[PDB]
Structure 1
C-alpha cells in the first residue's frame, strides 16, 4: 500500500517535483503502466498531480494552496501491456500543510461602542474581532493578538482605553472621560497572528461617551 503524503503550500523552485515512487510487484512478470485518477489528477483541478506511466513516479506540477484545497484523494492504477489491471486501485491521500500567508481580518471595518463618562477604570466597553484563514488547528499561523495602535483625540491623555490581547474586549483604562470636551474617540485597533508577532491588519473602533 502507499502511506500518507504531505506537501507544503506555496513551494517555489522548479516544477514538477518528485513526491513518491509507486511500484507494482507484477513488474517482474509483466510490463506495467501506471495512472492516477481523482480531483487534482484527471478531474478538476486537472493535472495538479501527474505520474510517469513507466517509472511510477508521482509528481506535483505547481505550488499548492491549503486555503483552496487542503487534501487530495487520488487513486493509482497498474495495468499490464496485455490490458489487464494487475492491482486494485490504490488510494493516495495528499495533505497540504499550512504557511502563514493570510493576514488576520477584522469582522467589520468600523466597530461601534459607547461608555458612560463616570465609568470606573476596569469597566468593559465593547469588543472587536478578527479571523485568520490559516491553520489554527495545527499551527500558530492564525493565533491572533489584539492591540490598540492609536487614539484620537489623545485627550485628556493617551491610553484612555485598553484591549485584552486574547479576547478583543476593550475596557476603560484610566479616569477622565469628559463628554463635554471630547464627545467621541476613534481607536485604531490591530490584530496580528503568531500570537501577536506575525502578520497584521487594523480596523477602527469608535466610542461615544454618554452621560
Structure 2
C-alpha cells in the first residue's frame, strides 16, 4: 500500500475518563509475526512527556489527559512497529494530531466601562463609538471565537427606549432615533453584551456611557 496517512483530529477538552483511546495503530504484517508498537515525538517521549502513549501489544494510541488547543494546537508523533527481534517491519508511521477547537472560553470586553459621545444634532444612522470583546477560541474555522454584540438596556429611557443600536459584528454603536437633547438628557448608560457562537453561546456584560453634546 502507498497511500499517505492523513492526520487525526482530536477535539480539545474531552470528557473523562482518561486514559482513552484515539485510534488503533496496526501493521498488516501481523498476519506473519508478533508485532510491538511504540511512539516518539514531543507529546510522547520528549517534552511535553506523557500526553500520549501506545499499548505495546494492541497498538492502541492513548490520550492521557484532556487537550487544550489554546495551549498546544498540533502534535507531530511517530508510530513504530517492531518484531520480537527489535527490528523495524515498517517505516515509522506519521501521526499528525490536530487539536480541534471547543468553546472553552467566554468572551471578554476589553474594558468594563467604555466612554464615548455624540452631538445631539446628528442624523439617525450616525456612529457614536465602538466597543470590543475578545474570545480566545477559533473564530476562523469555527463560531466558538465569534462574538455577537447586543444592547441589553438603556438608562434613562428618555425620550424613549431605543435611542441607540449596535452593529452585531463590529461593535459600533449608532444613533437610531430623533430627540437627542443634552439639556433634557445629558448622558445615557447602555448595558452592552457580547455573546460567542455568534449569538448562540455565552454572554458577558459591560457598559457604554454616552455623553450627549451640543
Output the TM-score relative to the length of structure 1: 0.89
Indicate which of 129, 132, 142 corresponds to 1:126: 129
| Local SS of the residue matching 2:9 | strand
Indicate which of 8, 17, 21 corresponds to 2:20: 17
Does the alignment pair 1:44 with 2:19? Answer: no
Aligned-pair distance for 1:79?
3.1
Aligned-pair distance for 1:29?
5.4
Aligned-pair distance for 1:97?
2.1
Aligned-pair distance for 1:56?
1.6
Aligned-pair distance for 1:31?
4.1
Does the alignment pair 1:178 with 2:185? Answer: no
**1:137 counterpart residue number:** 140
**2:190 counterpart residue number:** 187
**2:100 counterpart residue number:** 97
**1:62 counterpart residue number:** 65
Deviates more, 1:108-117 or 1:81-90: 81-90
| Local SS of the residue matching 2:198 | helix
Aligned-pair distance for 1:197?
2.3
Counterpart-to-counterpart distance in 2, 1:124 and 1:2: 53
Aligned-pair distance for 1:185?
1.7
Counterpart-to-counterpart distance in 1, 2:65 and 2:114: 40
Instruction: Specify every segment of 5 or more residues in structure 2 that has no aligned partner in the other structure, as ranges.
Output: none
Deviations 1:169-194 (A, max 9, x none): 11111122222243222211111122
| Local SS of the residue matching 1:84 | coil
Indicate which of 134, 151, 154 corresponds to 1:151: 154
- CA 1:165/1:56 → structure 2, altered by over 3 Å: closer, same or farther? same
Alpha carbon RMSD of aligned pairs, Å? 2.0
Aligned-pair distance for 1:156?
2.6
When the two structures are aligned, how many residues end up with a matched partner? 211
Does the alignment pair 1:168 with 2:208? Answer: no
